[PDB]
Design an enzyme around this catalytic site. Sequence first.
Site, PDB file in Angstrom:
ATOM      1  CE  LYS A   1      -2.773   2.588  -0.084  1.00 27.85           C
ATOM      2  NZ  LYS A   1      -2.742   2.908  -1.544  1.00 27.85           N
TER       3      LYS A   1
ATOM      4  CG  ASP B   1       3.765  -2.510 -10.837  1.00 29.84           C
ATOM      5  OD1 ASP B   1       3.900  -1.413 -11.304  1.00 29.84           O
ATOM      6  OD2 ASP B   1       3.960  -3.059  -9.489  1.00 29.84           O
TER       7      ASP B   1
END
Lengths: 324, 61
Positions: A115, A204
């Site tokens: 990442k 979320d």
Amino acid sequence: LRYMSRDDFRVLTAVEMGMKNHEIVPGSLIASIASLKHGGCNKVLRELVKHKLIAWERTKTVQGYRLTNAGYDYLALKTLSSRQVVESVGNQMGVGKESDIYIVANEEGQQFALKLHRLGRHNVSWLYLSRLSAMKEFAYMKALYERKFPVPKPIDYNRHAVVMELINGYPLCQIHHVEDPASVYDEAMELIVKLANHGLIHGDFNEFNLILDESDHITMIDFPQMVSTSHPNAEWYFDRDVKCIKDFFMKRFSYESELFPTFKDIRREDTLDVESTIPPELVKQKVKRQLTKQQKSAVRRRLQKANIFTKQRRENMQNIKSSL
Amino acid sequence: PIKLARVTKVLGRTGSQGQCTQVRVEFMDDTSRSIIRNVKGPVREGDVLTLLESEREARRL
RNA sequence: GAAACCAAAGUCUUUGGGUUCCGGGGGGAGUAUGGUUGCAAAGCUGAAACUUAAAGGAAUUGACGGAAGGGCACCACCAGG
RNA sequence: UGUCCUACGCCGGCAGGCGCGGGUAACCCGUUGAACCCCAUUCGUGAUGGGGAUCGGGGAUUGCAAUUAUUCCCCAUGAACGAGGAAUUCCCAGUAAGUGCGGGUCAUAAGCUUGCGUUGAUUAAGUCCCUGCCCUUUGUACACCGCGUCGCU
């Protein structure tokens, strides 16, 4: 890719040390603080600008070089290779505007994920906030893997880059049919109960963030935004996540819910919401450090010696002579 | 306990995005308690409100 | 007077009232050595080799502020479509 | 808009052919006979008749040439698609949006671009929070302390 591996490390780390104090780094500072080779560093910087490693900057008086995104990525990858973590690159690109996913393979050949935080005032704030985001994300992955949550195993990190455990799969959105919705749904509320028990509420918690490892395992990522349960809005986020999962399951798979957990249980688990007596050798080392300090000051004040102004003055004098 | 209200004077616009209106409130309990409150949405001089709780006072000073 | 400033830092190329100390580009370096004093700490006197094209003093404008205030925009936001 | 735009009749499932007239244009296309919308029938919550791609055959135009489908027409196969995260674009009243029409290279070729009419709203009339931008005042011409071990000639 990289071919020569001698002095791009030192020059680029000198550029990194220059970026830590100011915007645009002159070459004098680079030559002063990277002193292993002298004189040839100008052609080294000339070789770096042919790639997107560094960039020149000469507007009206300021004259320097700055680090680009690709140079910072190669710096992190070189630091990973110094740790013997990455040998070859797998080109399965997960192209996101907030992060780039590159497959890596070590000397053993075992594939891991990489990442690279790309965040999108100039780009020094972008790189610094990418570093901070990578640091807090690595801390969150370490905490979640220490608390036995179904997340990959963290491996390594270098300044924006995260070498992370590789699990193949697809996100829950683009899996059209699930053979066993009830079992994975009950496991989903089990994970919700576990997260709420661990003093944490997602806010979320989306199905797109849930990756179906062979439609059998749940993979969870992307925690920069992770908030506390001490907030008064925590149960509103928790109920929003619960209703989001519920409406997704009664809307997409046509499966109706059977268990309805509405529990706020804090904090029965770990509170992750915060998360000639002196020997002559020393005398020699100290005197060597001193003399290197004076010679570094001398190198700074010698390398700090604008030829564009002299060229313009010569051109102005020549034009005044040839026009009058 | 729910108490009725009245708008006496609109004072200004407060909030981060200028979404709230700071207003003065007169009571319909026959009292002269003019308390400065914060409301959301369009209010004009002469509007009537419904307060869930009255013991809270808004941001003064 | 280089000026900030100074009734003295004035009566200076129209340069001489008496007299003491003391400076000679920046470093090396107030260092080494020698002498002397001191219980000591150290004080006083005090180089050279070498290195360097500069170091400084006064003022004059203001890129850039991670300095502060105002104003404008649905190619910014708020409430929405 | 127009000398390629078409009025009328016949042969036509149907794109289209055949015989005829107008218009170098407020005249002929053209009261431009539009579309959503409305009024009645059927379907009835499922990859369904929704949605139409991708393929298979024929037919007719356009063009010296349609094979790598130019285009359209007649049957047939029905895919993904079950309201779409991070993020992002546009928008204050005949406005957005839905709906059709006209112009642009052009022998046939228009999911592009540009205007036009039709149905027509929600919210706001506030702010410097974010993104920037524009002014005013104001000071300013990379210093110090926190990168190394060993090896032979």
